[PDB]
Each structure stands twice: as structure tokens, then as C-alpha cells.
């Protein structure tokens, strides 16, 4: 059962959700953050600045269980 | 509590079990997979080829649950 798929690609970031509840997902580059929201069943997608999409990081947050990439 | 962190850095790579339990992690990169086995608590490294530090796939298998990182 895949559960949590992160896809960063060419400045697109790629989140997506295969539990059963909603979790939240802060993407930070360029020293920033920001919070999203991808519901269960569904893939959420950000894009990247060109300076900032070899380093980015993704924290995918679901009930108490947290999952980071960093690249 | 973070369960799974995989970091990707000029190649490096780096998986950490955040889990009570050992888990199997596929790395593939450049048409090669290699696959281990990591066990809680511990963090494992792996090193990637020049041609495939900007493309690779980490697969990471805890139990009945599977959790895909890819960069590219
Ligand atoms: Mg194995």
C-alpha cells in the first residue's frame, strides 16, 4: 500500500496523499516556508523558484506521524 | 514524531528509520537498484554515481506500507 508519495522534478514539487486522512505539507526553499493542505485520494502540486529547486525541503505531516525530504 | 527522512545531497543519500520496526529501502538511480534493510533507530548512506545524483528514486517499505521519494 503506498501511502505518501514525494516527486520533486525541474522546480515541481509533487505531494501526494494515499491514507485515509488529511495531512499537511510545509515546503521550504529559499528560506521560506509555506503550509498546504492534500486531502486523502488526491495530489497536490507546487512549483519552485529556479534558485531554490535544488534546495528545498518536504515535510509531509499525517495525523501524529511526520515524513521529510530534503534535497 | 518523524517517522521516515531521506535526505539526497550531491549524491549522497540518506535514510533514516524513525519506526519501531526494520524497514526495506530500494534505492534506484541511473537503471541500477540496489535494496536494505534498515533497522530502527539507525540511518543508512548511500552513495550515488555523478551521472545520477540529479535522478533517483527512494522507495522506502515499512511493513504493510510503502513511502516513495523521488527526486526527477
Ligand atoms: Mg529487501
Same mark, same amino acid.
Given at each position: ?11 515541481? /514539487? ?10 499537511? !505539507?510545509? *515546503?521550504?526553499? =529559499?528560506? +521560506? ?12 502540486? /507546487? ?10 525541503? !518536504?515535510? *509531509?505531516?499525517? =495525523?501524529? +506521524? ?6
Amino acid at each position: 500500500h503506498m501511502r505518501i508519495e514525494v516527486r520533486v522534478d525541474n522546480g515541481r /514539487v509533487r505531494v501526494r496523499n494515499g491514507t485515509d486522512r488529511p495531512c499537511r !505539507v510545509r *515546503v521550504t526553499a =529559499g528560506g +521560506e516556508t509555506r503550509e498546504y493542505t492534500v486531502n486523502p485520494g488526491t495530489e497536490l502540486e /507546487v512549483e519552485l523558484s529556479p534558485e531554490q529547486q535544488n534546495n528545498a525541503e !518536504v515535510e *509531509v505531516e499525517c =495525523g501524529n +506521524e511526520k515524513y521529510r525530504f530534503q534535497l
